[PDB]
Amino acid sequence: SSIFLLSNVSEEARQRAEEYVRRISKKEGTEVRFEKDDGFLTIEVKNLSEERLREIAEYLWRVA
Amino acid sequence: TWQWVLINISEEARQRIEEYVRRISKKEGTEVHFEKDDGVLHIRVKNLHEKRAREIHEYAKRVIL
């Protein structure tokens, strides 16, 4: 399980972050959970390849 | 196996999270692998139970905030 944690992200950026991971999990067929806690956005993906994990990390880092 | 990707967090928060995970990994008999890039901190803990993962995640948000 992989957990992406973002801080103080805008709802504009929160939508882009969630939308990017959804179609990845939609193509791989893996479970994904999106949780918001004040200024935190938690993106939890299950059984995701490290190749895809680095992609999400690079995108969220450019977004944040 | 649980992996955390903390994005654009403080240097002091990263220190507290790494030490907290190392203590948890020591008591549970597992090992943790850390990776650090500019603004991205990877934490990979092999053989971690579900309640431990939630605890580490809550402590992460506590010190990152």
Author numbering:
A (entry chain B): 66 to 129
B (entry chain A): 1 to 65
What does the article say, verbatim?
We determined the crystal structures of two class one designs, LHD29 (2.2 Å) and LHD29A53/B53 (2.6 Å) in which both protomers are fused to DHR53. In the central extended beta sheet, the LHD29 design closely matches the crystal structure (red and green box and Table S5). Aside from backbone beta sheet hydrogens bonds, this part of the interface is supported by primarily hydrophobic packing interactions between the side chains of each interface beta edge strand. The two flanking helices on opposite sides of the central beta sheet (blue and orange box) contribute predominantly polar contacts to the interface, and are also similar in the crystal structure and design model. Apart from crystal contact induced subtle backbone rearrangements in strand 2 of LHD29B that promote the formation of a polar interaction network (blue box), most interface sidechain-sidechain interactions agree with the design model. Association rates were quite fast and ranged from 106 M−1 s−1 for the fastest heterodimer to 102 M−1 s−1 for the slowest heterodimer LHD29, which is still an order of magnitude faster than the fastest associating designed helical hairpin heterodimer DHD37 (10). LHD275A, LHD278A, LHD317A, and a redesigned version of LHD29 with a more polar interface (LHD274) were also predominantly monomeric. For the C4-symmetric hub in the absence of its binding partner we observed an additional concentration-dependent peak on SEC, indicating formation of a higher-order complex. This is likely a dimer of C4 hubs, since the C4 hub contains the redesigned protomer LHD274B, that despite its reduced homodimerization propensity compared to parent design LHD29B still weakly homodimerizes.
We set out to design sets of interacting protein pairs for constructing reconfigurable assemblies. We instead sought to use implicit negative design by introducing three properties that collectively make self associated states unlikely to have low free energy: First, in contrast to the flexible coiled coils and helical hairpins in previous designs, we aimed for well folded individual protomers stabilized by substantial hydrophobic cores; this property limits the formation of slowly-exchanging homo-oligomers. Second, we constructed interfaces in which each protomer has a mixed alpha-beta topology and contributes one exposed beta strand to the interface, giving rise to a continuous beta sheet across the heterodimer interface. Our implicit negative design principles enable the de novo design of heterodimer pairs for which the individual protomers are stable in solution and readily form their target heterodimeric complexes upon mixing, unlike previously designed assemblies.
